[PDB]
C-alpha cells in the first residue's frame, strides 16, 4: 500500500489543509444535554457526527442522507469513526516558538541562527530586543538590545532600525536569513580555519544548514502560527457511571491555549498597554509549550489534582508511551491465562487445556461448526447452545481442537523457548497441565506460576505453530547446541537409582536371555533392581549409511540397566546405559541420540525416559529423613581445634606481635581451613561409608543415603548445600563485604542460635534484594542488545568472502578453558585446513564442520583453524548463511531468512540473571576504561621532546614515513618501554586496560572482535554459563556498522560525515566501475545504545530511546524511512522481513524495482 513514511516540518498551509475547521471556543459539552457545543473542542460540524449517520439537530437520521451537510446546524452526516480522523486548527494571534525546536539541546533554532539559547530565551519572553536587519549603520543584525539600549537608539534612530521582541522577532530573523549564502560563508570559514572546537562547531552548523536547504523545510516554519487540534476521539470526554465525566489532559491544555489566544485577541482589539499584551503573549507561549511538552519550561502546570498534566509529547515517549505500550506490545484477543500443573502423562507435543478455557477461547470456531453441521439454525442459536453448554457442544469442541495448536507463554519471555506450541488435550479442571520436560525451557516451577495461552487463527499461523514452535521442534537450545529437554530432577533420580549397582543384591550372578527376561525377573520379585548379572543384548550399529548391523554378545551389567535398555532406540551403543546415569549422562545420551538417529527417535526417547524415570523413582521410595543428614563425628574435634588456634592467635595479638588486620586475616584463614576439613570429613562419611559384605568379609560401595543420591545423581542440590545441612555452614560475610570473624559453626540439622540466625539473615536479605534489583538491569541490557541487532537477517546463501578468524583453544595459565572442539563446531571453514605437516588438504575450504569433522580434527590434533565469522561477511544488509554457521537450534546450516540478530540478543541476555553483568554491559557499551593503555599509534622509533608541566610529548618516527604524530603522555603514567626504542603499530606503551576503540583502530576488526568475545566469554565461563560465540560476533558486527570518510576523493561523501559502512562499501564497489575512487574510511565502534540510536530508520530509533531528539532530527532533516526492518514492520502491522514473511518482502521488492 505505502512504501515508506516521510516526516518533515509542517507548514501553516499544510496544517490548515489538514484541518476541517477552526476551533473558536473552549466549550466542550452543554452540561444539560451532553451533545457537543459548537464550534468548540468537541464540535459536530468540525469533527463529524457523534452518532452513526445521525445529524445532530435531528433533521437527518437515515443512511440515505449521507454525504450532505445540514443547515439548522451545519453538521455533515456520516459514520462516527470519522471523529478519530478529522483535525481542527487554532489561528494563534501571536506566533509561538515550537518547544521541541527551541529546547532540543542542541537547539535547532539557536544553531541555525548562530545565537546562544540563553539570548533566544531572553528574546522570546520579552526580556530583551533583537535587531532584525535594522540597518547596516550602527547595529548588527543579530545584535541584541535591552530596554535601555533600545530606548537610547530609538530617538537616535527612527528609520533603518528594526528591533522586536518575542517569537515574532525570532520568526523575522529566521525568515530573513538565506540558507545558500550562510552555507557558502560557513564553508569558507571552515576551509580557512584551524581549530578543532571551532571546526566541529562549523561542521555542525553547516550540516544543519545543508539538511535544512536540501529538504523542503523552511526555517520560519519552526515558529508555530497555526496550531493543529487532535481529533476528539483521541482526547475523549466520555461520561462515567453516576454522572461523573472522564477527560484527557489534552482537553485542559487545549482549553487553556484557546482561552489565552482569545484573551490576546481581545486585548489587541482594545489596544491595551504594551505591558499587558506582552504578559499575555508570554502566557500564550507558555500554554503552547505546556501543550506540546509540559516540560522544558521550569515548572509543569498541573491539573485539578496536584499531578502534572500529560502533554502531547508525553503520550509518545517513555515506557508508557504509544510506541512501547500499544505499538510494540498489545493486549490480544483469543488469549487466556491460568495456573500450571505437572500432568506427567502428556506427550512432549501436547498440553492439557481446561475444558472451560478451551470453550471460551474457541467460541467462533464452535459457532461455525454448529452452523455447518446444522445443529444451530442461526448464529444466535449457536451462542445460546454454547452458553447452555449442551451436550453436543462438547463434541463440537473436541472436533474443533483436534489438531489446532495453541501457544503457551510464561510471564518473563527471556528467550525463544519462552513461547512454544502444543496440541491441546481437554482437561476436566481449571489448571493448565504442562509437560514436565519443557519446564526447564520455560524456567517454570509449579509453585503457583501462571502461563498464558494464545490461539493461532489463520492457516498460516497454525502452520507456523506446527512447523516452527512445536515443542518437538525445539529440543536444542538456540544459544548453545546442548539439548534443552533434559530430564530434570525426578526422572534423573529414578534413572540413577535404577542404573547403579549394589555389591550383594538378590539374584546376583545369574545369566539372562535379554532385557525382557530382566524385566520379568525384577517385576516378579526374584531379583533386585540392581544386581550384577550377565545378559545377552543385541546392539545395532550404523557404520555405513542406513544399514543397521546387529551385534549380539553377553554383557556384564545389572538388571536395572538391562531393563532400561529396552527404551533405547536401535542405532545406539549399549555402553551408554552401562554407567550410573547421572544428569550429565542422560543429557549426553539424548545428544548422541539426536546426532545419530534424528529428531523423531529423540522425541520418543525423551518421552520414554521421562516415563521410566518417574515410574522407577516412585518404586524407589527415595525419602528424606532427619537421620539422612549425618553429622561428622569429627566436627566437634575440628571446631575445638579451630577455637584453640583462634585463642592462641588472639593471645599472640595481645602480646603485640601482629596487627589487628593480620590477626583477623589469619583467623579467617584458619577458620576456612577448618571448614574445608569439616566438609571433607562429612563427604567421606556420607558418600561411600555404606559398608556391606558379599558372601565374605566386607566390601565398600557408594552410599545409598537419600540426600547423597540426590546430590550425586545431579537431581537437586550440590556439595555446598549438603555441607550446609550436616557440616558447618562456613563463614558469613556482612553485606558490606567484611567476612565475620566468628563463623556459623552450627549446621541446619542442629539448631542455629539467635546470633547465627541474625548473621545468616544479614546475607539472605542482601541476596534477595540483589536478585530483585538484578533482573531490571539485565532486562535493560537485553533490550539494548535486541534493539542494536533487531535488523539483522540471513539474506544471502554465500557471500564468497575468503576472510575469516583463526579459532584456537583458550588457555590461561597453561590450562585449557575451552577446547577447540567446542569453538569450531558448526562453523564453515574460511580457508583450506591443512595437517600440521602440510601433508595434504584435511578438509575442503567451505565445509560445515559438523561433529565428524571435529572428531577428525581432534584425532589429528589441529591446534588452530580459520573459520568464517559474521563480522567478516561481505554481504550488504544481512549476512550469508555460510558465514553464520550451524543454526545451533537445528543441526543443518542456517536457513535463509532466520533473524539471527534477535536470537543472538536473546541468547546473550537470558543468562544475565545468573550473573559481573556490569562488566558485560561496559564491554557492549564500549565504554573506555578510566586509565586506558596508551598504545603505539604508529610504527617507528620512539623519542621524547618537551617535558615541562605540559606533560611529556612522545614522538614515533617511521623509517621513511612522515612523523607529525606526537603523543602528550602524562608523566605519572609509567612507561613500559624506554626512550630510545622502536615500537610496532598497536603495541603497548603505557599499562592498563585497553580501550576497544584503540584496539580496532590499531590492530584491526579481528583484534577487537576477538577481544570482546574473549572478555565476555571469560565472564560467562566464570559464572558457568555457556554461550556460542556466533552471538557475540553478531553483536560486534552490529557495533561496527558505521565508518568515517578519511578521504572522500571522487565519491559523493564529505570528510567528517559518518556514513553507514555498507553505503560506503557499495559506493566503492560501484566507483570501481569507473577509474577514480578516492574513497577511504576508518571503521568506527559505538556502544550498542549509541549504535542502535544512530540508524537509517528513524521510526526504529524513535521507538526505544529518547523520542524527542530523534523526531526533531528527522523532522528538520526531512528523513524518509524505508521500512526494511523488524521494528518498523512490526509497528505498522506488516509481515516482518525475517521469517515466513521474508519471501513476501522479496517479492514486494521485486515488484518495486520494476
Amino acid at each position: 500500500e505505502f512504501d515508506a513514511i516521510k516526516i518533515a516540518l509542517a507548514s501553516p498551509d499544510m496544517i490548515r489543509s489538514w484541518s476541517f475547521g477552526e476551533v473558536k471556543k473552549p466549550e466542550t459539552i452543554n452540561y444539560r444535554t451532553f451533545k457537543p457545543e459548537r464550534d468548540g473542542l468537541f464540535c459536530a460540524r468540525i469533527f463529524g457526527p457523534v452518532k452513526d449517520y445521525e445529524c445532530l439537530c435531528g433533521k437527518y437520521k437515515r443512511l440515505k442522507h449521507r454525504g450532505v451537510i445540514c443547515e439548522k446546524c451545519g453538521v455533515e452526516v456520516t459514520q462516527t469513526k470519522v471523529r478519530r480522523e478529522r483535525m481542527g486548527h487554532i489561528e494563534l494571534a501571536s506566533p509561538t516558538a515550537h518547544i521541541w525546536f527551541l529546547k532540543s539541546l542542541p537547539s535547532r533554532i539557536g544553531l541555525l541562527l548562530d545565537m546562544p539559547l540563553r539570548d533566544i530565551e531572553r528574546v522570546l519572553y520579552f526580556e530583551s530586543y533583537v535587531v532584525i536587519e535594522g540597518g547596516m549603520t550602527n547595529l548588527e543584525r543579530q545584535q541584541i538590545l535591552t530596554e535601555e539600549q533600545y530606548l537610547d537608539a530609538l530617538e537616535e534612530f527612527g528609520d533603518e532600525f528594526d528591533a522586536k521582541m518575542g517569537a515574532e522577532a525570532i520568526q523575522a530573523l529566521l525568515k530573513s536569513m538565506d540558507l545558500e549564502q550562510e552555507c557558502e560563508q560557513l564553508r569558507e570559514e571552515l576551509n580557512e580555519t584551524n581549530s578543532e572546537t571551532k571546526r566541529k562547531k562549523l561542521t555542525k552548523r553547516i550540516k544543519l544548514l545543508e539538511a535544512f536547504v536540501q529538504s523542503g523545510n523552511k526555517p520560519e516554519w519552526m515558529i508555530l502560527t497555526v496550531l493543529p487540534v487532535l481529533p476528539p476521539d483521541l482526547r475523549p470526554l466520555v461520561p462515567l457511571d453516576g454522572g461523573r465525566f472522564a477527560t484527557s489532559d489534552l482537553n485542559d491544555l487545549y482549553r487553556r491555549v484557546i482561552n489565552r489566544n482569545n484573551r490576546l485577541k481581545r486585548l489587541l482589539d482594545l489596544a491595551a498597554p504594551d505591558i499587558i499584551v506582552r504578559n499575555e503573549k508570554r502566557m500564550l507561549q507558555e500554554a503552547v509549550d505546556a501543550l506540546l511538552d509540559n516540560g522544558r519550561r521550569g515548572r509543569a502546570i498541573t491539573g485539578s489534582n496536584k499531578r502534572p498534566l500529560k502533554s502531547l509529547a508525553d503520550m509518545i515517549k517513555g515506557k508508557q508511551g504509544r510506541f512501547r505500550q500499544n505499538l510494540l506490545g498489545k493486549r490480544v484477543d483469543y488469549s487466556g491465562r491460568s495456573v500450571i500443573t505437572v500432568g506427567p502423562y502428556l506427550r512432549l507435543h501436547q498440553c492439557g487445556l481446561p475444558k472451560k478455557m478451551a470453550l471460551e477461547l474457541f467460541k467462533p470456531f464452535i459457532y461455525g461448526k454448529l452452523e455447518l453441521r446444522g445443529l444451530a439454525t442461526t448464529i444466535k442459536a449457536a451462542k445460546k447452545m454454547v452458553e447452555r453448554e449442551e451436550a453436543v457442544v462438547w463434541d463440537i469442541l473436541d472436533e474443533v481442537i483436534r489438531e489446532h495448536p495453541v501457544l503457551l507463554n510464561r510471564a518473563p519471555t527471556l528467550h525463544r523457548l519462552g513461547i512454544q506450541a502444543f496440541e491441546p488435550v481437554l482437561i476436566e479442571g481449571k489448571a493448565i497441565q504442562l509437560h514436565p520436560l519443557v519446564c526447564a525451557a520455560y524456567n517454570a516451577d509449579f509453585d503457583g506460576d501462571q502461563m498464558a495461552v494464545h490461539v493461532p487463527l489463520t492457516l498460516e499461523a497454525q502452520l507456523e505453530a506446527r512447523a516452527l514452535m512445536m515443542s518437538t521442534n525445539n529440543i536444542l537450545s538456540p544459544a548453545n547446541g546442548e539439548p534443552i529437554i533434559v530430564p530434570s530432577q525426578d526422572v534423573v533420580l529414578g534413572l540413577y537409582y535404577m542404573t547403579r549397582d549394589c555389591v550383594n543384591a538378590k539374584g546376583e550372578g545369574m545369566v539372562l536371555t535379554g532385557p525382557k527376561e530382566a524385566e520379568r525377573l525384577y517385576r516378579s520379585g526374584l531379583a533386585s533392581l540392581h544386581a550384577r548379572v550377565k545378559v545377552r543384548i543385541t546392539e545395532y550399529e550404523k557404520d555405513a549409511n542406513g544399514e543397521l548391523v546387529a551385534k549380539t554378545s553377553l554383557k556384564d551389567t545389572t538388571v536395572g540397566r538391562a531393563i532400561l535398555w529396552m527404551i533405547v532406540p536401535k542405532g545406539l551403543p549399549y555402553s551408554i546405559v552401562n554407567q550410573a546415569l547421572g544428569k550429565k549422562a542422560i543429557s549426553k545420551m539424548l545428544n548422541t541420540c539426536y546426532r545419530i538417529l534424528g529428531l523423531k527417535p529423540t522425541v520418543i526417547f525423551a518421552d520414554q525416559i521421562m516415563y521410566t524415570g518417574f515410574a522407577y523413582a516412585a518404586r524407589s521410595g527415595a525419602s528424606v529423613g532427619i537421620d539422612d543428614m549425618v553429622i561428622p563425628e569429627k566436627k566437634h574435634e575440628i571446631i575445638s581445634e579451630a577455637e584453640a588456634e583462634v585463642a592462641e592467635i588472639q593471645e599472640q595479638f595481645q602480646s603485640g606481635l601482629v596487627t589487628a588486620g593480620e590477626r583477623y586475616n589469619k583467623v579467617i584463614d584458619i577458620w576456612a581451613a577448618a571448614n574445608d576439613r569439616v566438609s571433607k570429613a562429612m563427604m567421606d562419611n556420607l558418600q561411600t561409608e555404606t559398608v556391606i559384605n558379599r558372601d565374605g568379609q566386607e566390601e565398600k560401595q557408594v552410599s545409598f543415603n537419600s540426600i547423597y543420591m540426590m546430590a550425586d545423581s545431579g537431581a537437586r542440590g550440590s556439595a555446598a548445600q549438603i555441607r550446609q545441612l550436616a557440616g558447618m555452614r562456613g563463614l558469613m560475610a556482612k553485606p558490606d563485604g567484611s567476612i565475620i570473624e566468628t563463623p556459623i559453626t552450627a549446621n541446619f540439622r542442629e539448631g542455629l542460635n539467635v546470633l547465627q540466625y541474625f548473621i545468616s539473615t544479614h546475607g539472605a536479605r542482601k541476596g534477595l534484594a540483589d536478585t530483585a534489583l538484578k533482573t531490571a538491569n539485565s532486562g535493560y541490557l537485553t533490550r539494548r542488545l535486541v534493539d542494536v541487532a533487531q535488523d539483522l537477517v540471513v539474506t544471502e546463501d554465500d557471500c564468497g568472502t575468503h576472510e575469516g578468524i583463526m579459532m584456537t583453544p583458550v588457555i590461561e595459565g597453561g590450562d585449557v578453558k575451552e577446547p577447540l572442539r567446542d569453538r569450531v563446531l558448526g562453523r564453515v571453514t574460511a580457508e583450506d585446513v591443512l595437517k600440521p605437516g602440510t601433508a595434504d588438504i584435511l578438509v575442503p575450504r567451505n565445509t560445515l564442520l559438523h561433529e565428524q569433522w571435529c572428531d577428525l580434527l581432534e584425532e589429528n590434533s589441529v591446534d588452530a583453524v580459520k573459520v568464517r565469522s559474521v563480522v567478516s561477511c561481505d554481504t550488504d544488509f544481512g549476512v550469508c548463511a555460510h558465514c553464520y554457521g550451524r543454526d545451533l537450534a537445528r543441526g543443518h546450516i542456517i536457513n535463509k531468512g532466520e533473524a539471527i540478530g534477535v536470537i543472538a540478543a536473546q541468547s546473550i541476555g537470558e543468562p544475565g540473571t545468573q550473573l559481573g553483568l556490569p562488566r558485560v554491559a561496559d564491554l557492549f557499551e564500549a565504554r573506555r576504561p578510566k586509565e586506558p593503555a596508551i598504545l603505539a599509534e604508529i610504527s617507528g622509533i620512539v623519542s621524547f621532546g618537551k617535558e615541562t608541566k605540559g606533560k611529556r610529548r612522545l614522538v614515533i618516527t617511521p623509517v621513511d614515513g612522515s612523523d607529525p604524530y606526537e603523543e602528550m603522555i602524562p608523566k605519572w603514567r609509567q612507561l613500559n618501554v624506554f626512550e630510545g626504542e622502536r615500537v610496532e603499530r598497536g603495541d603497548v606503551i603505557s599499562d592498563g586496560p585497553e580501550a576497544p576503540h584503540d584496539i580496532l583502530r590499531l590492530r584491526g576488526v579481528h583484534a577487537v572482535t576477538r577481544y570482546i568475545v574473549n572478555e565476555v566469554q571469560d565472564v560467562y565461563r566464570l559464572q558457568g554459563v555457556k554461550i556460542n560465540d556466533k552471538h557475540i560476533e553478531v553483536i560486534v558486527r552490529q557495533m561496527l556498522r558505521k565508518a568515517t570518510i578519511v578521504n572522500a576523493g571522487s565519491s559523493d561523501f564529505l570528510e567528517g560525515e559518518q556514513v553507514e559502512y555498507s553505503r560506503v562499501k557499495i559506493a566503492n564497489r560501484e566507483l570501481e566501475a569507473n577509474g577514480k575512487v578516492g574513497a577511504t574510511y576508518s571503521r568506527d565502534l559505538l556502544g550498542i545504545t549509541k549504535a542502535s540510536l544512530a540508524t537509517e530508520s528513524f521510526i526504529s530509533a524513535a521507538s526505544f530511546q529518547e523520542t524527542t531528539r530523534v523526531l526533531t532530527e528527522a523532522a528538520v532533516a526531512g528523513k524518509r524511512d524505508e521500512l526494511r526492518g523488524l521494528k518498523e514492520n512490526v509497528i505498522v502491522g506488516r509481515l516482518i522481513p525475517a521469517g515466513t514473511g521474508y519471501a513476501y518482502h522479496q517479492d514486494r521488492m521485486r515488484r518495486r524495482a520494476a
Partner: protein, 309 residues
Amino acid sequence: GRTTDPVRMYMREMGTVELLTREGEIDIAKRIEDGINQVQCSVAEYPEAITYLLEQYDRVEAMSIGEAKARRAKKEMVEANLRLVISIAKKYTNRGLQFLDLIQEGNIGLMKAVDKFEYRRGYKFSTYATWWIRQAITRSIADQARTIRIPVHMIETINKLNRISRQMLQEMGREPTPEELAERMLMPEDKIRKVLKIAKEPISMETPIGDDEDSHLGDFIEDTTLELPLDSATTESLRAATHDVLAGLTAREAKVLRMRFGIDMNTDYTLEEVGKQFDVTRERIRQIEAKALRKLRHPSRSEVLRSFL
C-alpha cells in the same frame, strides 16, 4: 539572576513604576479628559460630521494628538494601578484558573474601570476600580474555569447553595439534606437535586488507579459505541436470509417490499412514490404488501426468520 516563571517576569516589569501620589490620579484623569476634549473638538469642527449628526438625530426622533493624549494617561493610570489587580486577584488563586489568568482578567477589568472612571465625583479610584476588577475576575472564573462550562446564573445558584450548606453545617452539626435546604432556600426541592447533580470537574483520564500500579483510569474505560462481532455476523446473516426469502417471491411483490423498506437501496419509499413508479393506486400497493407479508408469514418459509428473533 535569571528565571523562567512568567509571573516573576510580570512582577519585574510592573514593579518598575511607582505606585502613585494622591491628586496624581485626578491629574491623569484630567489629561484623559483633555484628550477626549481634543477629539470632540475635532469631530465637532468637521461640518460633514455635524450634518451626519443632524441626520441621525432626525432618524432617531422619527484627531490624533487628542487620541495620543487619551492613550497616554490611560497607560499611566492602568500601569499605576496594576498592583491593585494583583492584590484582589490573589484571593481567587485556587478556583481552577491559574494566577496569571486571573491577573490578566483583572487587568482587563481595570482598563474598563479606567475608561469609565469619573474624577469629578471626588472619589478615590481604588474603590471604583475594585468593583470592576472583582466583576471581571469572577466572571472569568465562572466562564472558563470548568471543562464543561456552566452559565453564570447557574454558577450563582451553585455558590449560593454552597454558602447556605456551609452555614447550615455549623448551625446544625452534621449536614443539611436536600429537603432541609428547601426551607433555608426557597426552591422547589427538585431544582436543588439538579444543582447538586450538576457534574463536578471531570476526573483526569491519567489518574493513577489504586495500589500505585502503572495503570491509569483510562485503561478501564471501554468504547461503548462499538458493534460486537456477533452482532455484525447476525446482521450479515439476516441480510442474506432476507435476500433469499425475497428471492422466492413474485417479481413485483418482491420489488414493492424491497422499496417499502430501505432494503439494499436508499431511503424507503412511500406508497405514493411506489405508485408513481408502478403507475398503480396507493391502496393497491398497500394490499400487495399486506399479501406479501401474509405469504412470508407462512411456516416453512420464515422459520429461520423467526429464529432471527
